[PDB]
């Protein structure tokens, strides 16, 4: 009834990019993590500011479209423009591939950091159930789930049972 990040992604999550689904005796409820989502959005907006800005260099006309320029310097200009646009096309393809790969790896790293954080909160009270979930052994209510949502979960209160 409940599955994890390793298995799939939840389409019902709308409050954020990374969420906490908990199955409990009281019921089933979901939320979102503000820290990991906010960090991912900040890094993606940092990428976007960096790229979206265009140049401030001013370029002139060097070729009259209406009246043809001498052929020799015209062929030199055409060869230089083709070489320059080949360089810029290669740089554009490379930059798009780099930022796409880095965005995917960035999201995977943020998920890994979140998963390690919830693992560090559950010292010896819970254990890892295969698909990206934690099987809680101690009886603890929705107050426990909201306490594990923030970084206020106490391990010593439930450690014995």
């Amino acid at each position, epitope marked *: 009834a409940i599955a994890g990040f390793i298995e799939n992604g939840w389409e019902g999550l709308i409050d954020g990019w990374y969420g906490f689904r908990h199955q409990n005796a009281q019921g089933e409820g979901t939320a979102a993590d503000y820290k990991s*989502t*906010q960090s991912a959005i900040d890094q993606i*907006t940092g990428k*976007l500011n960096r790229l979206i800005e265009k140049t401030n260099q001013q370029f002139e006309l060097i070729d009259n479209e209406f009246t043809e320029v001498e052929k020799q310097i015209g062929n030199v200009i055409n060869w230089t423009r083709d070489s320059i646009t080949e360089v810029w096309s290669y740089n554009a393809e490379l930059l798009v591939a780099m930022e796409n790969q880095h965005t995917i790896d960035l999201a995977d790293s943020e998920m890994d950091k979140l998963y390690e954080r919830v693992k560090r909160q559950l010292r010896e009270n819970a254990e890892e159930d295969g698909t990206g979930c934690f099987e809680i052994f101690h009886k603890c209510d929705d107050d426990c789930m909201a306490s594990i949502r923030n970084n206020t979960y106490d391990h010593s209160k439930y450690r014995e049972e």
Partner: antibody
Amino acid sequence: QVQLLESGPGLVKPSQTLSLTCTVSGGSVSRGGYYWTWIRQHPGKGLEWIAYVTYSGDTSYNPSLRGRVTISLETSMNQFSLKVTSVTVADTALYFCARVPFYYDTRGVFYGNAEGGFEIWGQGTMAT
Amino acid sequence: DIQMTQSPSSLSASVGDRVTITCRASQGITNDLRWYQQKPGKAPQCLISSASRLQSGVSSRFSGSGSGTEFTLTISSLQPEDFATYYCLQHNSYQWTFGQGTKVE
């Protein structure tokens, strides 16, 4: 151009219920990722937070008066309403509604439209 | 009910003087403090979200800082249109509380 216009009676009998509806004139109220909040201030005092509701259903009324205020989200007529029962003289104040975003996006990576990331407040409707 | 205590309540300063203003929280509020400015008889508008950075559409002269229980907002240069009232909101817990009030003149 989302405008959080407010509607209300403006004249409240004592020890009766009061209905305050903040109509959302824009894209949608069912977008998600926003706190739909009610904020009030008596003149000469400070602002006092009342309640917040989301489309997902997370509702936390002010610890000050959990019983008196019931905030509900109504998708069909694109509004969220605040109802305060047993209205006294101290309950009379100037009321505001606000769309507080969950995250800070300048360029619209999560909200999508780059204007949804802003915090839009209502004009205000005084209630007696 | 993290107590939000602002101090001092009333400020008077000349045009072009830096205004150092303090917002005090009781608990270890972690990185959560929206700053609200409201003209008298006018809807409030946010200046500093997340306590260290500006909102778009707000002038860059507003600058906020501080972490933990101590929170500061700095104004580089006062304006005739800056006659207003400055608040601070916390949103770390499930509860939201305002401050008492800080007015510039």
